[PDB]
């Protein structure tokens, strides 16, 4: 209603678990917030160019805005921060992509990137971190690190399910937990406030399936479960039971010596993949001090956002690392950073984040060559030290070059 | 009624907030499961040679065993993981000291570490961690890290209330949730297990003063409460406000420019100290980017266990990591590893982490010479390279010791 669709271009389509993906696709892409004027800006160049180079013209990608943030209340009205139409269009067209996004406060608003992953069930939060060659790392050895997380994004205490202290609601709640249920275990139950944490066997297994997928597909060597189930057994230790249940189950998972770790002969390769599981605080020493003892991670809401942020500051990437929320009907590519809005505007944020989105955007699509296309350049306009003001304090020789300009850098290593 | 106390010594008393120690204190220790065994004989001779050094003969701590775990099993008959005694004794006593502890799985037996936390009330969980010039780490700049965790040890999802997936009970909260509470945000209500988070204001507000008050005894330079607020509003997100609140209230905390930062003047050192907050996973990628930035954290029950873990890997210590639990009535220190079975008995593993607690238990004391000398032999046993299998690994040119050879190296470097 106010996006424009492009007069060229045709929809993808879903023809059963398998995207049929035109010649001149029109994709949706939200501009984002903050840097987000600068980083779009520099990703649609660098995507076109790359499937320029990389079918010789035949193939070209429509571009539609759509909106959702702080640009939709300047579009919509001051006070639609989430437009419905936003949720029909990525459902329609399948594949979009995103910027950073201005949460308000003030409003009652949660979260809109929950929002999204909630409004249209994108269960799969995909990170893939991996070492860039040649970017300022804070330990020795980075490039130990490569690791996809599988993190759940539809359960947790994630699902915003709480009640303020002193609120009648909580109140009501607390005294069901007392009364009715008999806990005795809330040590101040006056002014308290209380969040539910849900995890589901279907929740759970919907995520392991696509990780094991994911690790046969890709002929990765091990799928680690992890979970803080010591402390609690009813949610995060369900997630490594029905985790473990589902590799025996559907991929004919075998005890190795007397348990617990599962080995799954993968179908294609004739490899077999570890599935193992690890407490979550030993977990985030062991990616520090034996990161190559890991591959393929999956895990619940929160520890997958803890996990995914620690691992991308270790390899230099807090401003470099991709991201996608994955459903059945449709994803959503995305910066994962914030919109950092003292600098937005001024053309010199690092645009490598919404870039190597944009690649698993391409790869996901089927357009492969011009997704290896980005990761070519990206290699080298990082290796020619040819780099970003983030990335240039912390190098020494280094070239300081604008927003716009490192998309032109890595047009010239493609 | 097995413990046998020890004819000499005399009981550590409080006298109104202040402990009144004797010159032969009564210090009950439990040995703990695993390598329990062969730690803790290393810490009461390193500690009674720190204690004989420091006061030429005119102080020695009477040390009276206790039970918790695999042992109390041994000695009280199969059944009964943690006596009633334990808990008397250790309110008793007022300051004891514990290795590593075995929970069952099977006999639906909750944490006993957590168990020892909640029942005696020791709402502090205090986790220094520095730098021991020296040791292996995995980060360039270990030296960077000096930070002091105060982990809110009595509510969070830690509490354990929760319910099984299918049993009556999940079935009847979930019920409640969505008939009498009307939430529609439970993705799959069916096969779902359901575990509960509470934050209150007379939990958040007693452990953010004694991180304060720490920071003002010690003159640390901040003090960081640390919170995923942005998605958890009513329990992380009031911890945030609660905590600026009691700084304000409290201790007279002012703005800094227009917020949200505070600064709090400490009344004898005229310094002041900021109390700001960061966001959870911004926070695991901040410590790693920027340590210096940070000195006292405050945070809730399973971040402060995240972050403590992490922290102690990056700096090389998460052998040497020491811990205490502090209430009002008493305070019980300990070893912050696991039991290690695969190594038990064989003298080989590094005391190091229930050495460090126990001069934190000294300290604690007022018997700071004694505790000065044990960080003193600790420093220079490391320096020496005179060390324990797990940092000879890494290290070159070290010379390897066992467990209570270590022990002796510290005695050494006094």
Request: proline share 5%.
């Amino acid at each position: 209603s106010k996006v424009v669709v492009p007069a060229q271009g045709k929809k993808i389509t879903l023809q059963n678990g398998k995207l049929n993906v035109p010649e001149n696709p029109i994709i949706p892409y939200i501009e984002g917030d903050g840097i987000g004027v600068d980083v779009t800006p520099a990703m649609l160049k660098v995507v076109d160019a790359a499937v320029e180079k990389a079918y010789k013209g035949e193939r070209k990608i429509s571009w539609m805005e759509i909106y959702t943030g702080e640009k939709s209340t300047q579009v919509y009205g001051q006070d639609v921060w989430l437009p419905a139409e936003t949720l029909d269009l990525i459902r329609e067209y399948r594949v979009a992509i995103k910027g950073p996004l201005t949460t308000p406060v003030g409003g009652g608003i949660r979260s809109l990137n929950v929002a999204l992953r909630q409004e249209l069930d994108l269960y799969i939060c995909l990170r893939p971190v991996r070492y860039y060659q040649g970017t300022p790392s804070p330990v020795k050895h980075p490039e130990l690190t490569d690791m996809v997380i599988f993190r759940e994004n539809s359960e947790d205490i994630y699902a915003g399910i709480e009640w303020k202290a002193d609120s009648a609601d909580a109140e009501k709640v607390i005294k069901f937990l007392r009364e009715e249920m008999g806990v005795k275990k809330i040590r101040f139950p006056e002014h308290c406030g209380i969040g539910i944490k849900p995890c589901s066997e279907e929740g759970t297994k919907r995520l392991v399936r696509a990780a094991i997928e994911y690790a046969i597909a890709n002929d990765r060597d091990s799928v680690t479960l992890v979970h803080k189930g010591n402390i609690m057994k009813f949610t995060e230790g369900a997630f490594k039971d029905w985790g473990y249940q589902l590799a025996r189950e559907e991929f004919g998972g075998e005890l190795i010596d007397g348990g617990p770790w599962l080995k799954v002969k993968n179908p294609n390769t004739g490899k077999e993949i570890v599935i193992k599981d690890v407490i979550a605080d030993a977990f985030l020493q062991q990616i520090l001090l034996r990161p190559a003892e890991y591959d393929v991670i999956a895990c619940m809401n929160l520890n997958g956002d803890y996990i995914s942020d620690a691992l991308a500051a270790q390899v230099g990437g807090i401003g470099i690392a991709p991201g996608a929320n994955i459903g059945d009907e449709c994803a959503l590519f995305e910066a994962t950073h914030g919109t950092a809005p003292k600098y937005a505007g001024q053309d010199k944020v690092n645009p490598g984040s919404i870039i190597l989105s944009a690649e698993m955007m391409l790869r996901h699509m089927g357009w492969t060559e011009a997704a290896d296309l980005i990761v070519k350049g990206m290699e080298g306009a990082i290796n020619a030290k040819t780099v970003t003001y983030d990335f240039e304090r912390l190098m020494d020789g280094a070239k300081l070059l604008k927003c716009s300009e490192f998309g032109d850098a890595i047009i010239e290593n493609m």
